[PDB]
Amino acid sequence: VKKLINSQISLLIGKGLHEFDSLRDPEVNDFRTKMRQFCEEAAAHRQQLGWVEWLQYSFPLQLEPNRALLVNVKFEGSEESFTFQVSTKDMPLALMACALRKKATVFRQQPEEYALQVNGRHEYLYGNYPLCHFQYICSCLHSGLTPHLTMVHSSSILAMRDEQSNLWSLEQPFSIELIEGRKVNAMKLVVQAGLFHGNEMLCKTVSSSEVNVCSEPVWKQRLEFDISVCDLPRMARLCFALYAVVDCPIAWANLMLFDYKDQLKTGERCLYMWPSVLLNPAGTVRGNPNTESAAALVIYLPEVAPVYFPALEKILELLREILERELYEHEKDLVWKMRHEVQEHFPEALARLLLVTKWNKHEDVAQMLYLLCSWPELPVLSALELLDFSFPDCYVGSFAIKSLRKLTDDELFQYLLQLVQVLKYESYLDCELTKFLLGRALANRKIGHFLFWHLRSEMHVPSVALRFGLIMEAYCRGSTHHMKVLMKQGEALSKLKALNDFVKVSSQKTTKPQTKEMMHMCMRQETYMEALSHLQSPLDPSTLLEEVCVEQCTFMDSKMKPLWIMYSSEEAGSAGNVGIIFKNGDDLRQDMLTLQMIQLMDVLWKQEGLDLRMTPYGCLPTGDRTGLIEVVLHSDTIANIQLNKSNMAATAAFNKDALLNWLKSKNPGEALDRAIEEFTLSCAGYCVATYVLGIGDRHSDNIMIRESGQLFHIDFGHFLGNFRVPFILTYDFVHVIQQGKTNNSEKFERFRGYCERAYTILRRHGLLFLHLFALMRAAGLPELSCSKDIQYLKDSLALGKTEEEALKHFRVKFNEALRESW
Ligand SMILES: COC1=C/C(=N\c2nc3ccccc3nc2NS(=O)(=O)c2ccc(F)cc2)CC(OC)=C1
């Protein structure tokens, strides 16, 4: 059985576990055994949770960031069901009491024994919360729908739980011998090498002497650094770049000077180099796995006597306000001098102090750490800053995780993407961030779900395959059942890929009707009906994808011919009618990021009582240029609606009227006002989000409207100004906001206020976006490469200005956009 599980893990994670063994690598081996044990413990803990606690693990609550309503309720084993009138303010427990009193009378005769499942979803309603605090009840009110719930007894939830079981001494200056190489180029070669702690150089960057492009080159050269060996900080990083000149970059390579056991390295190393875009401190500290093709530098770390980094026990032994809100050498001096007073009275300025400390002076680092040990825990916002690559010190990292542990699961979920990217910055395999993410992922199945996908979607990237592979393994060891659930997802994805490859070939040889029919026959094969049906959605583990409706599946006409897959579920009723789009050929990372930031905006807006009626739909890369999009049904593109076809409801005298005619036909009589309001609010949200994020190439083909009137965006190929984007007001949106009237400053100006509120709220959290994007610089998203991309956010949010000036500035941009409206 152990063999079976091992083989399933290899299939799931996209790397055979034998590849870990073949490395004959102590660190890998220690991570696997340590992490296996940690994960296994978490599962044992889990197998004995109370039933409500188990629910908490498996179906975490979906909550929003008097008035009456109708609800339908039924019990697990029977078809019979009752419709109740309840108040949005009622607890689930009250509703459950009605359900039982109804059962008792019909069936001729304890609420706390039950949870309420949402029909045909992995979603539950429990806790002391009024019904409308639950996302699902709230959603039902806006969409108009009746909530349909099922009474699930504790012995049934427990039956589910059961089925799911498993030193200071050395004053001589640091130096290395550069022996030889083996590589390809056109001219002379030079090796440049610098020592880094994060971004900062610990001293100047020394060079080789020009040697001809010959060989297989040979140097055998001491390179002596302008720094003492005793001063090398724990996280010292030695970086190499090899290039050509008579500037032509060839390759780069980095390593930590101390191994994972705190021991300084000696003697000879062979460094398999990574091909170039000279010095790359933020690049990984593990060699290029393609040893056959990779250029290889061989160096020699000289024996300085085994020597270890001193224990913390040995470390611990060894106008200020006016600036503190980039700083000159003297200003830096006042900060270091007043470090205790910073700890005592400004513990939130920890990062500014950490940047000013001299990381190339062992004494100063001792004192800095000493303060860090007694430092009070910081708010999450501050912790998110300390995870930036500027803070490579693992006591700082340890501190930041410590300050992060107080994240809620919802918060942790909100930032999961960024924390995963920060994994790429880590100097070693076993680290606090890994243990933290794995622990929280095993304590919450939703977190586990997305941690897995964020990792799985990057397995094709050699610089991260080993790390990400090992983490997924560890997870699997901690949840066997969930491993099987994920395989099912991976089997579905694998089928879609073959199906999509067919569609691409077929679409070049035949007419769309014929390709569609052939897609359908292919889908109707047993292997395909089996693989594509009865899974959890990778977009949302609480969405069940039951029976694929082949007849409604199809594909779109865009280059990659993405697949449109429809699903249905008897047990979920209408709500189990859901769509996913499969796309293979495009990078979805950028779209995922943009959608997460828009969803964050919506969370922040709603926290100040502003609901802009946003559509935060799923988008999830799953593999190499592969991922999924959640279909928002009952929507169409502006372009399609503006085709202004005859013989339809929406037929207008003037094209400017098409959009509003369409809304009218989907919203008869009195419902039109609300649709127009829905459209106005969402328009404001998306105009602000696109403006702040620098999303250009917005046009009628990538903007969609729902039948409710809500407006949303698809296909973000470009953000942060990369193809300074103006604020955008389109005439046809303006026409709709103005209820079809030429002049309507009452409606238009309400709209302006929506934008202004939405924008001013985001500025108050500007720092949160800045820290989040800072962390994403680790993703290697092509439009999120350097500082000038972050600057785009500094400028769009005008964080330098007071709220008076920023609102003045925003007002001009807005007015400028209105003038551009014809
Ligand atoms: C999110 O909900 C929907 C998405 C839909 N399509 C697409 N969503 C995307 C979201 C993010 C990134 C790319 C998306 N592409 C969608 N469709 S598409 O690939 O055919 C397309 C690509 C480029 C375009 F300008 C327009 C559509 C369609 C739809 O109903 C028709 C609902």
DSSP for 275-316, written as a single string: EP----TTS-SS--S-TTTS-EEEEEE------BPPPHHHHH
- Contacts of 45 by beta carbon, 8 Å cutoff, 6+ apart: none
In the chain, domain spans: 1-47+311-479, 48-166, 170-310, 480-631, 634-822
What is the CATH T-level fold of the domain 634-822, as seen in this structure?
Answer: 1.10.1070
Report CA(738)–ligand 1 centroid distance (Å). Answer: 28
DSSP reduced 3-state for 580: strand
**700 Cβ closer than 6 Å to some ligand 1 atom:** no
What DSSP string describes 757-816?
A: HHHHHHHHTHHHHHHHHHHHTTS--TTS-SHHHHHHHHHHTTTTS-HHHHHHHHHHHHHH
Report CA(658)–ligand 1 centroid distance (Å). Answer: 21
User: Does 3.10.20.90 match the CATH number of domain 48-166?
Assistant: yes
Separation of alpha carbons 565 and 544, rounded Å:
14
Residue identified by tokens 């979805």 is 588
- Contacts of 604 by beta carbon, 8 Å cutoff, 6+ apart: 761, 762, 765, 768
Residue identified by tokens 């890369």 is 621
Tell me the technique behind this structure.
X-ray
**Resolution value in angstroms:** 2.5
Q: Are strands 148-153 and 68-75 parallel, antiparallel or unpaired?
A: parallel
DSSP reduced 3-state for 467: helix
Report CA(564)–ligand 1 centroid distance (Å). Answer: 10
Please state, as a whole number, how many other Cβ atoms lie within 10 Å of the Cβ of residue 204: 11
- Contacts of 538 by beta carbon, 8 Å cutoff, 6+ apart: 449, 453, 489, 493, 620, 622, 628
- Contacts of 133 by beta carbon, 8 Å cutoff, 6+ apart: 63, 64
Pick from 187, 238, 194, 166: nearest CA to 2: 166
CA 700 to chain CA centroid, Å, is: 28
Token duo for residue 528: 């395909």
Cβ atoms of 179 and 299 within 8 Å: the answer is yes
Instruction: Tell me the CATH architecture of domain 480-631.
Output: 2-Layer Sandwich (3.30)
**702 Cβ closer than 6 Å to some ligand 1 atom:** yes
Residue 582 burial (C-beta neighbours within 10 Å; 0-12, 13-18, 19+): buried
Separation of alpha carbons 529 and 549, rounded Å:
10
**581 Cβ closer than 6 Å to some ligand 1 atom:** yes
Residue bearing the CA closest to ligand 1, atom 9 = 714
Cβ atoms of 522 and 499 within 8 Å: the answer is yes
560 CA closest ligand 1 atom index: 19
Separation of alpha carbons 80 and 276, rounded Å:
67
Superfamily of domain 170-310: C2 domain (2.60.40.150)
* Segments in 524-670 forming alpha helices (H): 526-532, 589-607, 638-641, 658-666
Token duo for residue 786: 């350097």
Separation of alpha carbons 408 and 387, rounded Å:
18
Please tell me what DSSP assigns to residue 273.
P
Residue bearing the CA closest to ligand 1, atom 14 = 715
Tell me which CATH code domain 1-47+311-479 carries. 1.25.40.70
Residue bearing the CA closest to ligand 1, atom 4 = 631
**591 Cβ closer than 6 Å to some ligand 1 atom:** yes
712 CA closest ligand 1 atom index: 1
Separation of alpha carbons 107 and 774, rounded Å:
61
Separation of alpha carbons 751 and 506, rounded Å:
47
User: For residue 532, which amino acid is it?
Assistant: L
Token duo for residue 137: 């009840």
What b/e sequence results for 334-345 when a residue is b if at least 16 CB atoms lie within 10 Å of its CB, and e otherwise?
ebeebbeebbee
Separation of alpha carbons 663 and 563, rounded Å:
28
Please tell me what DSSP assigns to residue 230.
G
Phi-psi region of 561 (alpha: psi -120 to 50; beta: other; left: phi over 0): left
Element containing residue 118 per DSSP (H, E): strand 114-118
Residue to mutate (ligand 1; options 560, 629, 703, 708; most atoms within 8 A of CB): 629
